[PDB]
Amino acid sequence: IKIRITLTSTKVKQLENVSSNIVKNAEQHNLVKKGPVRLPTKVLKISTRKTPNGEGSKTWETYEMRIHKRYIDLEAPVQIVKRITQITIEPGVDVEVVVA
Amino acid sequence: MLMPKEDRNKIHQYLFQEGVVVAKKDFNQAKHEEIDTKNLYVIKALQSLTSKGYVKTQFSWQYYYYTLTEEGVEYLREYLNLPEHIVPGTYI
Amino acid sequence: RKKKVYTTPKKIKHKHKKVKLAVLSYYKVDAEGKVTKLRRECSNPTCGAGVFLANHKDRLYCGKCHSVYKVNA
Amino acid sequence: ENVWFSHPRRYGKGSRQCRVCSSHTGLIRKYGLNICRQCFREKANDIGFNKFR
Amino acid sequence: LISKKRKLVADGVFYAELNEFFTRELAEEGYSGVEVRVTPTKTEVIIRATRTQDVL
RNA sequence: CACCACCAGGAGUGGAGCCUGCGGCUUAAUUUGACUCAACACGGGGAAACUCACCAGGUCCAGACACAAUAAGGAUUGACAGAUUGAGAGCUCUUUCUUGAUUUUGUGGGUGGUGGUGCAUGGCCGUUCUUAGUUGGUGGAGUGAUUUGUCUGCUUAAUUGCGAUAACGAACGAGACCUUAACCUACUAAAUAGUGGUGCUAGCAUUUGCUGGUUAUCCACUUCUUAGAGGGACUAUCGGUUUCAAGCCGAUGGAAGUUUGAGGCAAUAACAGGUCUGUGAUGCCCUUAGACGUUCUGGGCCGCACGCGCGCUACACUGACGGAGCCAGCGAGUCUAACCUUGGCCGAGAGGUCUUGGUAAUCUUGUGAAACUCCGUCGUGCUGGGGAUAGAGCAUUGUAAUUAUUGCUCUUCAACGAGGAAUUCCUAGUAAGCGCAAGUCAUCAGCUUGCGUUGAUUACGUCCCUGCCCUUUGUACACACCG
Ligand SMILES: [Mg+2]
Ligand SMILES: [Mg+2]
Ligand SMILES: [Mg+2]
Ligand SMILES: [Mg+2]
Ligand SMILES: [Mg+2]
Ligand SMILES: [Mg+2]
Ligand SMILES: [Mg+2]
Ligand SMILES: [Mg+2]
Ligand SMILES: [Mg+2]
Ligand SMILES: [Mg+2]
Ligand SMILES: [Mg+2]
Ligand SMILES: [Mg+2]
Ligand SMILES: [Mg+2]
Ligand SMILES: [Mg+2]
Ligand SMILES: [Mg+2]
Ligand SMILES: [Mg+2]
Ligand SMILES: [Mg+2]
Ligand SMILES: [Mg+2]
Ligand SMILES: [Mg+2]
Ligand SMILES: [Zn+2]
Ligand SMILES: [Zn+2]
Numbered sequence: 001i002k003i004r005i006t007l008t009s010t011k012v013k014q015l016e017n018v019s020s021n022i023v024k025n026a027e028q029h030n031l032v033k034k035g036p037v038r039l040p041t042k043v044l045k046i047s048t049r050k051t052p053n054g055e056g057s058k059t060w061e062t063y064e065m066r067i068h069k070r071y072i073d074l075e076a077p078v079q080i081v082k083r084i085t086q087i088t089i090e091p092g093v094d095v096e097v098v099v100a
Numbered sequence: 101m102l103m104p105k106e107d108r109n110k111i112h113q114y115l116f117q118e119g120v121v122v123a124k125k126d127f128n129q130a131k132h133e134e135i136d137t138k139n140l141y142v143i144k145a146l147q148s149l150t151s152k153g154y155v156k157t158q159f160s161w162q163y164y165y166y167t168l169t170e171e172g173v174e175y176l177r178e179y180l181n182l183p184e185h186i187v188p189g190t191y192i
Numbered sequence: 193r194k195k196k197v198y199t200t201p202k203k204i205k206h207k208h209k210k211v212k213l214a215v216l217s218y219y220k221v222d223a224e225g226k227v228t229k230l231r232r233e234c235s236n237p238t239c240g241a242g243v244f245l246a247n248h249k250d251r252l253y254c255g256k257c258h259s260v261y262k263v264n265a
Numbered sequence: 266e267n268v269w270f271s272h273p274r275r276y277g278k279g280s281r282q283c284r285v286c287s288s289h290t291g292l293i294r295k296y297g298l299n300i301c302r303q304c305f306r307e308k309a310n311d312i313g314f315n316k317f318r
Numbered sequence: 319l320i321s322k323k324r325k326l327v328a329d330g331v332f333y334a335e336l337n338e339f340f341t342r343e344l345a346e347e348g349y350s351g352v353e354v355r356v357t358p359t360k361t362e363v364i365i366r367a368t369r370t371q372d373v374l
Numbered sequence: 375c376a377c378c379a380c381c382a383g384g385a386g387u388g389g390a391g392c393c394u395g396c397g398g399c400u401u402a403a404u405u406u407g408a409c410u411c412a413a414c415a416c417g418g419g420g421a422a423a424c425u426c427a428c429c430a431g432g433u434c435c436a437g438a439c440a441c442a443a444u445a446a447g448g449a450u451u452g453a454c455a456g457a458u459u460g461a462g463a464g465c466u467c468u469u470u471c472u473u474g475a476u477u478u479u480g481u482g483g484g485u486g487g488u489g490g491u492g493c494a495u496g497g498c499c500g501u502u503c504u505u506a507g508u509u510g511g512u513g514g515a516g517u518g519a520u521u522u523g524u525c526u527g528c529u530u531a532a533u534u535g536c537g538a539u540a541a542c543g544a545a546c547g548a549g550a551c552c553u554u555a556a557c558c559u560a561c562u563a564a565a566u567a568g569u570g571g572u573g574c575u576a577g578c579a580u581u582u583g584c585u586g587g588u589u590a591u592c593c594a595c596u597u598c599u600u601a602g603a604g605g606g607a608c609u610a611u612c613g614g615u616u617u618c619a620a621g622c623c624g625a626u627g628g629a630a631g632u633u634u635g636a637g638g639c640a641a642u643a644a645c646a647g648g649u650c651u652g653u654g655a656u657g658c659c660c661u662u663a664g665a666c667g668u669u670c671u672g673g674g675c676c677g678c679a680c681g682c683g684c685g686c687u688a689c690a691c692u693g694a695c696g697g698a699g700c701c702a703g704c705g706a707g708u709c710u711a712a713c714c715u716u717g718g719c720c721g722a723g724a725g726g727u728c729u730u731g732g733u734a735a736u737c738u739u740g741u742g743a744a745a746c747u748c749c750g751u752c753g754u755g756c757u758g759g760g761g762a763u764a765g766a767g768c769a770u771u772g773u774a775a776u777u778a779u780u781g782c783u784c785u786u787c788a789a790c791g792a793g794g795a796a797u798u799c800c801u802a803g804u805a806a807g808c809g810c811a812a813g814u815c816a817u818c819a820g821c822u823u824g825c826g827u828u829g830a831u832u833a834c835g836u837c838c839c840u841g842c843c844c845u846u847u848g849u850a851c852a853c854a855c856c857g
Contacts, residue, residue, distance in 0.1 A: 054417025056500030279424030
């Protein structure tokens, strides 16, 4: 059946227990699964000057944004696939399913 | 402002139906969305309506949020000659 | 700032707001007959024989369609 | 007349503006957010950008 | 079909825009922040104010 | 006390040619802000148009709303051709159609302004000062303002702490914290990461091997790659020296022993510091229809006798040119758009064209980067150093490239032979060399923010110079010596 859950949040601790609750609820339903592949975290960096005007000492400033992205691959008949994704949706954590 | 009578009735009838109107502050955009008239018309006409206590505005990152008042539902109704309590915003 | 001399040549020619003309709709008038029409109209797909034609020097207009309809006599 | 607002605005500093304050200078176009540099710095914390290092 | 970099930064600017709208007009009900929740079939936006009777 | 000071040094700058910013001069305009540190590659300010504020001209109203006036025997709007105009702005006029209460003319009253004032303000930022500084409670001294605590000394990056001790015990700042980089054959796992095998093959040998290719060969694996949870360093152990105390200095072990390295955050009290040109942040003043609004066309911001300040290329065999080898890390990238571009073909090139992959650990991409390395020609000659300044063509971006946008070819081939007085930065993966990505970006990097690559010499001090802090002291000062 080959469905795949992908998680792409920025909050790591929300993301993990989402991912843990996928894999643990899998194991009551006893499904074979590729355990979470953790892709390299990608840092979005924006380096701006502090001052609004152009006076003073040239102090710069780097704002960054870390994005964490995991995927879990599952094979399951339809009733578990309807059950797993319907629950365990946590705010700020993005979930999307692809099949095959 | 001098705009033909038909599109002021478009703006005024669309306002009645949605209770609200959103309008990007882009003059010369020349084509509103949700309405087939010029963007400058819907801004300026709703500027004429707010200056008579019928609609209130909020700028909020160049978008001009309009929601019409209790004065607005009575005036417009007189204007469109529609049946009483025919305003969508007013009745859930 | 330094000054404003308003240097440029004076060309204040704000226009005429289409001066109110006298009694109009002169189709023709006929003593005890049906009236024909001066200023030929237009065989258009919209205009329903209500719009007249300007009579210029060697051309006929439209007014509402701003397109010449002159044809050779 | 049609000649009003007729010059192209497809590229260059005249095509883009800050989505908050409609300014042309110091725009930040990385990652497609298009906010001026002084307005992003006021909005960076609630967008999700933070200072760590 | 937009990349994850842009998608997450878009939801940041979406929150930032929607916070400014709520703080500008809902000031007189004690607006103290907003939360957005993407969900299958719906997006839910929980307004946090003090005079909750006034916002309704 | 401190490489924004010196010491011992390194690499420079100041000389030269160009690039860029400021002043000056010039101009129709060469828009403007900022003049020690704490203005001058700064306003993310790499301006062809736009941006844009300046200059020469031309449109428009996008002058809400109210009250009057006008006025359905028309309040007002639009225009074909011609004159006009840079113009296919009917902008204005000749000419006469069309529209229909939306407008028009005044009175108010608004609105817009990158107009003024940052010495009227907010917020933010810079600076004092990222130095080590600041304050209560209770007790003691004093009539009191105040003082001690908060110190002679030693110590530390540090009012960091030991010690002395009318003071004890704390608070903020420092430190802790957080991020990041270094260790983990320990855990949890993975064709979007990678090995090893086994299939299928290629080449070479031939023994029982060597090196590759292969995506449906599949089975196992986690060392290397990635990130979750954790562990680990605490100057541990020993020696030496010091009220034998805080510490400091050697050696051993260790992945790591300068605060383990580097940052982020950062007190009280200030400053007429900068910003009204980031803001739909703003008071007041000005302006508001021959506008200081908005838009369009064309210039300007780039103009060059000169004076400065950040830089780039060099002055040469520790090198230039040619061929061959050949290795990173940080990162960015398109859909309702046309961004990163593989591969094939054409072209000397720059480029063109046909397909493809990629919304991304999947594709560009092992980003095959440059310095460098190995072989060769040069042979101390302003020379094959240097490539400024000029002339012709071919392309690319773009509505447009002339005061050459940028790229390519050929030719022309200047100063400069290590730079006076002056002066800057720096203590280990650091200085310096060398490139690449990102930001701005339709095009344009000699700039900045980062990242790797190659990698030294010298010191492990001091108050001599320059700054800042403290103590004692004098004072007729206290908007505080610019008294
Ligand atoms: Mg400055
Ligand atoms: Mg020089
Ligand atoms: Mg500048
Ligand atoms: Mg400048
Ligand atoms: Mg102007
Ligand atoms: Mg204005
Ligand atoms: Mg202006
Ligand atoms: Mg001020
Ligand atoms: Mg006391
Ligand atoms: Mg007493
Ligand atoms: Mg006391
Ligand atoms: Mg010793
Ligand atoms: Mg040469
Ligand atoms: Mg690269
Ligand atoms: Mg020449
Ligand atoms: Mg000296
Ligand atoms: Mg260098
Ligand atoms: Mg004396
Ligand atoms: Mg005195
Ligand atoms: Zn017609
Ligand atoms: Zn802005």
